Amino acid sequence: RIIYYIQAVIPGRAWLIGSNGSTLTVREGSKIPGYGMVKLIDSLQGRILTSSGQVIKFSQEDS
Amino acid sequence: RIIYYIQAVIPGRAWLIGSNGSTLTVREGSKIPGYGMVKLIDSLQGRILTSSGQVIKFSQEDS
Amino acid sequence: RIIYYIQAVIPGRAWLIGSNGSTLTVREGSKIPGYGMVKLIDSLQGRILTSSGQVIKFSQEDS
Amino acid sequence: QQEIQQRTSDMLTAATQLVQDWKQVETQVYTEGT
Amino acid sequence: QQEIQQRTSDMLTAATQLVQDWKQVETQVYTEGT
Amino acid sequence: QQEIQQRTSDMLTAATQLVQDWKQVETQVYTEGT
Amino acid sequence: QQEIQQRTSDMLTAATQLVQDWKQVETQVYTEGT
Amino acid sequence: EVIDKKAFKDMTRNLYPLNPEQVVKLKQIYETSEYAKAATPGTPPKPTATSQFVNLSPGSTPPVIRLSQGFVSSLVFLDSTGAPWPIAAYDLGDPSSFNIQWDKTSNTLMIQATKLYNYGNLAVRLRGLNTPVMLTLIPGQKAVDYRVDLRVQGYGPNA
Amino acid sequence: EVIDKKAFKDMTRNLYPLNPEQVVKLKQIYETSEYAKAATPGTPPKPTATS
Amino acid sequence: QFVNLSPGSTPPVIRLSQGFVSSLVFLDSTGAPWPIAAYDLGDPSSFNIQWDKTSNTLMIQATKLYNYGNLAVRLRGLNTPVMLTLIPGQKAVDYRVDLRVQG
Numbered sequence: 001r002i003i004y005y006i007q008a009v010i011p012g013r014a015w016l017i018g019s020n021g022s023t024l025t026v027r028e029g030s031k032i033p034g035y036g037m038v039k040l041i042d043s044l045q046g047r048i049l050t051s052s053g054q055v056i057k058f059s060q061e062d063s
Numbered sequence: 064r065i066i067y068y069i070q071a072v073i074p075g076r077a078w079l080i081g082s083n084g085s086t087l088t089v090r091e092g093s094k095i096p097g098y099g100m101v102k103l104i105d106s107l108q109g110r111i112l113t114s115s116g117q118v119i120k121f122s123q124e125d126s
Numbered sequence: 127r128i129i130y131y132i133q134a135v136i137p138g139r140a141w142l143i144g145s146n147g148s149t150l151t152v153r154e155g156s157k158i159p160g161y162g163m164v165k166l167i168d169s170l171q172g173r174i175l176t177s178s179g180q181v182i183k184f185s186q187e188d189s
Numbered sequence: 190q191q192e193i194q195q196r197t198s199d200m201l202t203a204a205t206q207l208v209q210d211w212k213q214v215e216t217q218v219y220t221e222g223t
Numbered sequence: 224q225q226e227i228q229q230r231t232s233d234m235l236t237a238a239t240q241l242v243q244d245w246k247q248v249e250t251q252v253y254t255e256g257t
Numbered sequence: 258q259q260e261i262q263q264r265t266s267d268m269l270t271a272a273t274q275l276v277q278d279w280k281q282v283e284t285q286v287y288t289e290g291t
Numbered sequence: 292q293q294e295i296q297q298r299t300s301d302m303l304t305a306a307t308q309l310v311q312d313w314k315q316v317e318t319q320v321y322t323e324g325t
Numbered sequence: 326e327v328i329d330k331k332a333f334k335d336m337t338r339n340l341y342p343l344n345p346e347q348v349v350k351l352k353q354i355y356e357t358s359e360y361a362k363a364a365t366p367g368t369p370p371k372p373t374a375t376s377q378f379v380n381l382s383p384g385s386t387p388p389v390i391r392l393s394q395g396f397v398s399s400l401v402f403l404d405s406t407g408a409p410w411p412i413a414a415y416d417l418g419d420p421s422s423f424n425i426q427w428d429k430t431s432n433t434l435m436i437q438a439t440k441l442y443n444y445g446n447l448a449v450r451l452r453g454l455n456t457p458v459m460l461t462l463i464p465g466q467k468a469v470d471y472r473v474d475l476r477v478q479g480y481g482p483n484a
Numbered sequence: 485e486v487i488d489k490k491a492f493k494d495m496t497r498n499l500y501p502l503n504p505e506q507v508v509k510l511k512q513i514y515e516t517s518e519y520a521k522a523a524t525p526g527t528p529p530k531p532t533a534t535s
Numbered sequence: 536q537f538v539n540l541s542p543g544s545t546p547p548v549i550r551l552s553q554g555f556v557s558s559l560v561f562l563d564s565t566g567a568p569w570p571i572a573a574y575d576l577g578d579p580s581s582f583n584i585q586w587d588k589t590s591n592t593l594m595i596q597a598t599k600l601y602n603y604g605n606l607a608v609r610l611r612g613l614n615t616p617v618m619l620t621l622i623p624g625q626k627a628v629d630y631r632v633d634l635r636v637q638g
Contacts (some may be wrong), residue, residue, distance in 0.1 A: 031123065071622045073603065075368040078548050084537070086545050090368050094186065107605050109626060126626050134463045136391050136444065138527040141389050147378070149386050153527050172467060189371055189467045207521070219416045222429035233501040241507070242514055243360065248395050251437045251577045253426040256588030264491040265498075267342040272499055275348065276355055282554050285596045287585040298332040299339075306340055347492060354496060356600065361504040363601040366512045372605070372620060376542040384535040396605050398579040399616050409614050426575060433616060435575050435607060440513065442522035446531075461531060471546055471605065471618040 001034050005059040011043045016056065032056075064097050068122040074106045079119065097121075127160050137169045142182065157164040158182075370469040378476040381456050387446075390473060392423075392438040392464040399472045400434045402451065402458075407476075408483035416448035423447075423462060438464040453481055537635045540615050546605075549632060550580075551597040551623040559593045561617075569606040569636060570609065582606075583622060588628050597623040613638060 007015045007023070016024045016032075030038045032050065040049040046063075048056040070078045070086070077093075079087045093101045095113065103112035109116040109126075132143045133149070142150045142158075156164045158176065166175035172189075174182040343351070357402055370393055377388050402410045409432045417425060421441045427433075434449075444463045451458065458477065502510070551557050561569045567577065568591045576584060581602040585594045588623050593608070603622040617636065 027126070071550055071625050073369065073622060074364045076371075086547070088371060088545055090189070090371070114635075121626055134391060134466055136442075136463060136528065137523045141386075141529075149388070151530060152388055153530070184467055188373055190458070210386060210521075215421050217416055217418045218420050219414070220425075221414045222412065222427065233498070236518070237501045238510060241502075241510065244362075245511070245514060247577060248439055249580050250424050250439075251397055251426060251435070251575060252579050253428075253435070253573065253575050254584075254586070255428065256571065256586065257571045261487055261490050261494070264342070264487060265494050267339075268491055268495045269498060271342045272351060272495060275343075275351060279352070279355060279503075282598055284598075285585060285594070286585050287555055287587075287594070289587065295328055295331050295335070298328060299335050302332055302336040303339060306336060311341075344488070350492075351496075354500065357504055358500055358507070359600050361507040363599075364508065366508075366515055372546055372618075374542045374544070374546070374618070383533045384491075385533070387531055387533070395578050397575060397607050399607055399618070401615065428573075432614070433609075437577055440522075441487075441518050459533070472542075472616065474542060 003029065004035070004056050005062070006046050006048065006056060007045060008044050009041070009048075012041065014041050023025060067095065067098070067119050068125075069109050069111065069119060072104070072106050072109060072111075075104065077104055077111060130158065130161070130182050131188075132172050132174065132183060135167070135169050135172060135174075138167065140167055142176060334353040335392060349438050350446045368467075370467055372471050373468050374472045375470055376474040376476070379458060379460075379478065381409045382477050387459040387461055388475070390436070390462050390468045391468050391470045392436065392462055393466075393469040394438050394441050394464060396437065396469055398436050398470050400436065400475065401472065402449070402475050402477060404477055404478070404479060404484070406484055408481055409469075410477060410481035410483075413450045415450065417445075418444070418447070419445040422464075436462070438462075441465055451477065451481070454479060536632065538617060538637065540617075540637050546618040546620055547619050547634070549595075549619055550625045550627050550629045551595065551638055552625075552628040553597050553600050553623060553630050555596065555628055557595050557632070559595065559634060561591050561608070561634050561636060563636055563638060566635070570611045572609045572611050574609065576604075577606070578602070578604040595621070597621075600624055612638065 003019050004016045004024070005018075009015070012027065014026050014048055016026060018024070018058045024032070026032065026038050026041070026048075028038060032038065035054055035056070036051040037042070038048065039051050046058045050056065065119070066082050067079045067087070068081075072078070072082045075090065077089050079089065081087070087095070089095065089101050089111075090103070091101060091104055095101065098117055099114040099118070101111065102114050109121045113119065129145050130142045130150070131144075133143045135141070138153065140152050142149070142152065149183065150158070152158065152164050152167070152174075154164060154167055158164065161180055161182070162177040164174065165177050168174065172184045335367060370391075379388055390400065402412065404410050411430065411432045412427070412434070415425070415427070415434065417423060422438065422443045422445060424437045424439060426435045426437075442465045444461065447460045447462060449458045449460065454477075458475075538547055549557065549559065561571065563569050570585070570589065571590045571593070574584070574586070574593065576582060581597065581599045581604060583596045583598060585596075586592075601624045603620065606619045606621060608617045608619065613636070
């Protein structure tokens with residue numbers, strides 16, 4: 001599948017980058033392909049909770 | 064049918080865009096083709112109530 | 127017949143436009159062809175009362 | 190009784206401002222273009 | 224009782240500022256480019 | 258009782274500075290290079 | 292008891308200078324050589 | 326050694342009287358007050374573009390322009406065929422209610438209303454006409470005219 | 485700890501003496517006053533062109 | 536967006552935000568740029584416009600939170616002015632708007 005990584009996060013929004021180079025921006029209730037619905041955007045600590053249980057974080061080599 | 068989306072909303076008016084590219088503006092009591100009579104324009108949260116029961120909101124990809 | 131629509135209204139007068147493009151102005155006691163006598167000019171809410179029972183209002187597409 | 194004259198003096202101040210605003214009429218302005 | 228008269232004076236100060244701001248209308252600006 | 262009135266006056270001074278800082282918006286700057 | 296209020300006023304003087312020094316950010320300098 | 330903990334927490338409350346949770350609540354109070362101040366009573370007018378024919382007979386009524394306070398309305402003058410008709414001069418009554426911007430050669434007038442419910446008239450003289458064109462200007466209606474195309478009965482210098 | 489809630493609600497009432505509901509009602513009072521000021525007594529005259 | 540100069544259509548809407556820059560670029564029906572002759576802005580206390588006097592791009596910044604107005608733009612070859620409305624404080628902000636004019 002496609003893995004998404006956090007590029008920048010403020011309260012409210014989050015800018016994401018995928019393994020294909022595609023760039024997205026998401027809000028509190030939003031759709032991510034392959035992940036589902038955004039459940040919680042937590043601006044501190046760089047964590048995004050998703051309805052499928054997966055957690056989107058910063059990249060390990062870019063943090 | 065034709066799906067309408069909220070483009071901008073203030074108290075009183077709302078500007079709409081359709082799937083055909085047509086643009087409209089509506090008031091509290093007004094006619095929408097395929098929807099009926101406007102019942103409530105609620106400027107906060109981007110919701111418009113319609114007499115047929117359908118709810119016109121912002122577009123998912125443009126919000 | 128001919129349908130008349132309110133174009134502008136202040137206290138006292140009202141400016142009307144017809145389906146034939148003819149433009150009129152009326153006072154409290156005045157004659158309208160096909161309608162009768164003006165009974166009440168209501169500057170608020172855009173309603174004109176006529177002796178035949180018909181009500182002249184703003185146009186639906188221009189209001 | 191005492192509150193009547195206090196209300197009367199407040200209305201006289203507001204009525205004097207309303208009357209002199211209705212007195213003012215400005216001159217027309219003619220603009221020539223070339 | 225006297226807390227009503229104190230609250231009324233604070234609302235009159237705020238309402239005078241709100242009405243004065245609604246009076247102000249700025250003239251349009253025409254910009255010509257060449 | 259009197260410690261509430263002392264705490265209220267400290268928050269009113271800090272809230273005035275916060276609101277006044279949020280009012281300020283600086284005009285954009287256009288830079289042309291040649 | 293009174294030694295707490297004397298210590299608190301000494302800490303407020305030092306904390307004000309520390310916060311004021313952290314606000315200062317100096318603008319970058321571009322040096323062109325030819 | 327216990328005194329140093331007591332002095333630190335009392336100094337922090339004096340230095341920052343508002344919590345980070347209370348700063349967030351105050352910012353929501355401030356923007357809600359700005360939303361209610363900028364909201365318009367009733368419904369706002371509908372922005373429209375119109376087109377009228379102007380008859381210079383001594384029986385007809387002068388045309389009506391609908392305006393709004395702080396908004397711009399553009400008036401463009403055309404002849405019977407549809408070509409533009411340039412403006413020679415204009416004369417405005419009650420300049421305290423209306424403001425007009427005009428470059429001295431074109432055929433477009435841009436009028437802004439200054440007051441809410443005060444109305445007046447305007448005199449417009451075209452280049453080839455001898456009869457002046459009379460308009461009335463009423464603000465504060467249920468519709469606002471963004472642009473009015475005016476058809477004048479004669480033939481202009483362009484045809 | 486309960487003092488901080490009491491001081492916060494009293495500070496808000498001094499900072500904003502008018503509710504968002506009361507700002508909306510005051511704007512309707514203001515524009516109704518200008519409508520009565522600008523209204524003409526009787527009927528306005530009819531605009532005519534003559535020869 | 537496509538802009539229609541018919542006397543029945545509605546003027547287009549621009550979504551802005553306080554402190555942010557929105558750029559509007561004017562194109563014709565084929566897609567070529569259309570230079571601007573002049574512009575007229577109502578309520579200059581709510582919006583700020585930067586423009587070099589020859590190009591076809593306007594850069595507008597909103598100054599207030601929820602105050603809205605209109606704007607008139609005259610192009611080089613057109614006689615009909617273009618009317619726009621400017622509403623800030625929405626759920627979307629326009630970084631760039633492409634406008635097709637009918638002529």
